[PDB]
Amino acid sequence: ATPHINAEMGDFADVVLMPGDPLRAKYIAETFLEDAREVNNVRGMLGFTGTYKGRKISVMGHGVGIPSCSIYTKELITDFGVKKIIRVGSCGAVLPHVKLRDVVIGMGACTDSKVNRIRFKDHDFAAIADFDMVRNAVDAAKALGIDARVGNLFSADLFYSPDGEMFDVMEKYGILGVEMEAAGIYGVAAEFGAKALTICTVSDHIRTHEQTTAAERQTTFNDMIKIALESVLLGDK
Amino acid sequence: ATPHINAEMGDFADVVLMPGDPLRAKYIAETFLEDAREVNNVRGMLGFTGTYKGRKISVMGHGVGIPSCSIYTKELITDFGVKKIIRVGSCGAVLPHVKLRDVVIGMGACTDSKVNRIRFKDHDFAAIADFDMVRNAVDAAKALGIDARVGNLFSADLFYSPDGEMFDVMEKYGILGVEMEAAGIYGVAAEFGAKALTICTVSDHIRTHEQTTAAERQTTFNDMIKIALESVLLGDK
Amino acid sequence: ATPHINAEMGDFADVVLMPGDPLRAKYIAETFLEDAREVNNVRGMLGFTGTYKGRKISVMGHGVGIPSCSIYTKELITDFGVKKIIRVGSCGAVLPHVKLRDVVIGMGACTDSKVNRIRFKDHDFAAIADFDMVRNAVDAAKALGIDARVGNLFSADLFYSPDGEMFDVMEKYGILGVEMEAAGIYGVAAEFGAKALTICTVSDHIRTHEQTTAAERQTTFNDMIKIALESVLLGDK
Amino acid sequence: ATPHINAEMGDFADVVLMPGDPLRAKYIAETFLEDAREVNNVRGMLGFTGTYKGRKISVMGHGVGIPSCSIYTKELITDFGVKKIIRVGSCGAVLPHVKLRDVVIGMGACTDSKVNRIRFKDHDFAAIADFDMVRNAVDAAKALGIDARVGNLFSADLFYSPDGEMFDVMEKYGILGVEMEAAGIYGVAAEFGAKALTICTVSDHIRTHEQTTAAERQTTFNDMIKIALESVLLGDK
Amino acid sequence: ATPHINAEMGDFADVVLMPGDPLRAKYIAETFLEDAREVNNVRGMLGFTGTYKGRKISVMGHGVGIPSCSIYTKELITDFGVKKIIRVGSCGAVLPHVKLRDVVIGMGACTDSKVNRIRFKDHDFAAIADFDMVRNAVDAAKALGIDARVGNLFSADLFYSPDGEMFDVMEKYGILGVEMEAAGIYGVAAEFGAKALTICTVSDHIRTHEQTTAAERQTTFNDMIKIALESVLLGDK
Amino acid sequence: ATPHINAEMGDFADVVLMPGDPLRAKYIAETFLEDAREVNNVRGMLGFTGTYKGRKISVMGHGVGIPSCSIYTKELITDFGVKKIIRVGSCGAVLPHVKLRDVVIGMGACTDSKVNRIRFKDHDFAAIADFDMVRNAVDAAKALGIDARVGNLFSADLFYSPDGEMFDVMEKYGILGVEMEAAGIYGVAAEFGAKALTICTVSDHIRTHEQTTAAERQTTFNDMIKIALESVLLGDK
């Protein structure tokens, strides 16, 4: 057991999907996983383990922010033998052509956090996902009839940033989505020799304000989970 | 309502206690508050509002990490008229004389996060608590027969830091406890003109390893809540 | 003796009040101290030792700037057994509400200097004063019927800064006064294990642009001194 | 024409392969391109344009260092309509498993330079290659039965660094190869909206200390070129 | 008059020699200048104006540290028509071959202060002296038969630096002397359009720990003054 | 031989003139040196050795950028006995009074590169040239009747800087010319124990956008060469 995970080696699959909303852990378990079992409840961060088409998979939230997800991803890697971590969440878009409900795959992740500089002797560490996982997610999406967008995400420490102009810089450099974990998870993965990938659906615009019915979300959300799960099966091949 | 708080102005008291463990919100509500009511459940972050000796008070978790707590504290201040925020949690000690179960009041808060530099034009912003709140907590503790320790806390972005030596620097500079929110909350308070204070009980040593029975914790925890709540009443005077 | 202080262990009291102007030290000693004697003259940085209501007390200028006061405070602590240092000076206001002749107690101090970053491994070190000393100062003020504002000061390296935009930043984040020593003195207090406090009187308002020099301004300066001196008496008890 | 390129819009193909050694460009053009003609000679930075299996292709050295390649890639993109840039060079390994003659595809690139910080408001910009170009390169390698490692490269500013400790840091975080251009080229691609990729062959192992120069090493260099050229053909389809 | 100087235009010469210690300014005036007249006493920072071989000259202390010297140099340049500032202070030696009483001309000045970074958008500003003034000092020394090393000085913010290893870095890069003003004075000269030069007398050796001993605190301190004064005459010619 | 130079000790003179463009190195050799002999061709970075008025002299390109020039200067200093490096390149003017064809002597060199910060523990290293070499150039110019400004140069990493406003900062602080090597060369000279000086010919004006036009690309470029060569002779004397 670890400080934030009351479980033992083997309780988690070697692949773990992690939503930002804690409530989504249970939802994913009862909707996509078979024969699921609870493996953690520490601090209310419910963790589950089951199988998807025979493949063992676990699901558990990571909390909002690099600090929070750095804890869970780290403990899972070093103490529970986790090899892959797929973050499934939302993101705000700064580009005009990126619309709500669009699926973005963060091959890379910029950030204004200092965690990676702390790790890389104050130099620039390119926080990146595992290449194979990226391609697995892209193909999985294609197979479902979805055209995902692959590029850079921006992991912000402040949802309410005082530097509004930074969003302009993000757009100017091709940032596809703004979230709050990617860079941190990728940093942890590199630090402890694991693999990671972040998949997000555009929840809103950081310049205007589009609209998406309640159904659209729940539907696109299921689509994102399917992409993640099927990407794992492609990876196993 | 806000992105992370599904409530309206008035649903929260002007004073809010915020634990790091989400589960503690409900516990505090049913143990110390009277006539409590649920005011939020978004993303599973239960929020409650009641009265303590006639004084209106709300309680709700803030999540682990500066990013997470910066969201909640901000939304509460700007959209729900909150004037005071008291964080109640745990902390790791680096000083030999600071023992487990000790109560530490963070008058100041150092950090390795970049949020404050982002706010202060890359200069040094002294993340501090409201002075009156600090003295209210100190006196409240005294009245309960508890000698609190007042000084600097260190808000770390990484629970599992690669820079072990930094803990040596912390000890050399009088850091009383290492946690993961203070500096961020104090930053938000200064940014939006509110008042904040962080109170923590030593959960462990970052050099050795003492011991505290399960009872000791639950007991000292109740003590910390009492200190916080009574400090509010002293502030009202 | 030291390179900057030509005196011997014992000449100084364990409590030293330090104004920026060395001629101000002479003023303080002759005005408030009984049986005072000059204990230092090096570089014209006058130092004195006498008694206030029977208590042994010393006063000595610290020169302008963090680099200057860092030397004198350090030497007083490591070579003259000084346990407490109270800076009594002036500052410029940036807050509309902060008026001329207002007494400000710097519980914390922000800064443009990099001295604390050098000390704190390039991270954010919250330069704060000793809690008890702040409490004694506030209680002393109250006793004298003098209102006192407790908060953050800003220790600038350049009295004539090339970027006036920082002033709006200070105002936005609640800085009570701009001086040039507090942050440095607190760094030294932490590094060498001593206690320090900074008290200042608003001599000018950078906002409406206005200085203060008259019987009223000189009356307020004396009040600050009285606050400092009486605060140590309360501390002794 | 430009200050560094004495040619006209149309002389270069929309895809340019760029080695660090200008003499290497001559080698590539004569070895793989048909009906190739020199399109630039300024500063001895030879440039050529020809066809590979009917496809118009150009090759031109980029000089050593981020500052050098930043100029040429920028000009090619903004003044010569170049849409894709493929860097084909060498790198030094730090990972025990990465062997000599191994082909490394830099999906991302870390760095000691501050060029991207200047571009990204002093925050962390993840310098990454174009996903499709990386995918085409990997598929091309596969077709040639050539194994290829996809990951992070490290673009150093100093071939002779004063701090060898950074090498252990690179190894700990999985850097596949150390070169001196990738991070800069990716920054330029992002700033000016173009697509770029860096491919390299391990010419030396900084670990066991060993270079590679022979028929086998030259065979591997040609494979990298073949990979690059064939990757563009796949992209066209 | 200015904030820190009670005088009027014309009270100072167009060239001002400035030692860190006000008492040394007084010594210089009484020893080298004829018709010496005190022009300032604010904060005890003595300033004098007189003649040397018919040439009007001023000498005034600047206090310890960059923040202090920046004030006086600025005011002199913008309100008193000062064209040349020649600092005549002391310094600590780091190089083995540099001994006490040695004269050093700082054509350049390194520093760990943030003032120049504040002025130069966080980039590296090479704080250098006026070339003509440098040559004048060299020639002056030659004529007087006094040895003088021309090179880089280090302007430290902390006389009692917590980073001892930095001295090794200074030595490796040939820093001739360690003081606390050069880089700042040069920053002001460039910002406010004036010329400056720093000349120092090795006061002590940082390695051997040998301070200014013997009656060699005069003649040597005088050599520096002689050179500075004679350098001015050469410049006038 | 070295990694980037195919030659042996003795193949180069103890003094090497270095232009950024290899072709200009070739021009210098054939135009100013007798018995010119090509000593290197690796990567096309032409190097030559011959005699000028009886004095053995070498000239070799260093490529564009700090990373490039650092390599060649380093290798020459540690493996070929080079004692003096005199860069003879071009530069862009920011000051209104500086016109094309103007000669500039960089006694100092500012920069936005991180190389010196890497060498100097993130502090400010004043990248300066060798004083004697500077004076030799001034005197040489005087004798030849060629005007020359002695001052600060700016070594930029990005020829196509995204920060246009920085040019205004350069101008305000009197930067004579903008190039891409000075600060780096000086960093190497100090690190590896050698002497260097950078002389540049205003190639274009950053404001007016006037490039090197007319047949004035020779005689002027020659003045620079004449000064550099004659400065060496003076130094030998």
Ligand SMILES: Cc1ncnc2c1ncn2[C@H]1C[C@H](O)[C@@H](CO)O1
């Ligand atoms: C403006 C902004 N910044 C950061 N994250 C944002 C955002 N707008 C939306 N998000 C998304 C992604 C986060 O992970 C999530 C936080 O609730 O919402």
Ligand SMILES: Cc1ncnc2c1ncn2[C@H]1C[C@H](O)[C@@H](CO)O1
């Ligand atoms: C080593 C370390 N770092 C940061 N926080 C620590 C810690 N040891 C204990 N804590 C405490 C305070 C945090 O808020 C909490 C996280 O679960 O545990």
Ligand SMILES: Cc1ncnc2c1ncn2[C@H]1C[C@H](O)[C@@H](CO)O1
């Ligand atoms: C407006 C302002 N800025 C910086 N320092 C100030 C100030 N007003 C007063 N001071 C204080 C601190 C210094 O020690 C001194 C400088 O005049 O007075």
Ligand SMILES: Cc1ncnc2c1ncn2[C@H]1C[C@H](O)[C@@H](CO)O1
């Ligand atoms: C070990 C090492 N370090 C830095 N750059 C290296 C390298 N091995 C190869 N390179 C590459 C990138 C440059 O363009 C060039 C320098 O020799 O080769």
Ligand SMILES: Cc1ncnc2c1ncn2[C@H]1C[C@H](O)[C@@H](CO)O1
């Ligand atoms: C060892 C050392 N470090 C820093 N500054 C030093 C020094 N020795 C002498 N000085 C100089 C510069 C200051 O202005 C002055 C303070 O005593 O002496």
Ligand SMILES: Cc1ncnc2c1ncn2[C@H]1C[C@H](O)[C@@H](CO)O1
């Ligand atoms: C305008 C400008 N900016 C940066 N470097 C410049 C320049 N004009 C000329 N140069 C110089 C220095 C480089 O080594 C070379 C590149 O063309 O010319």
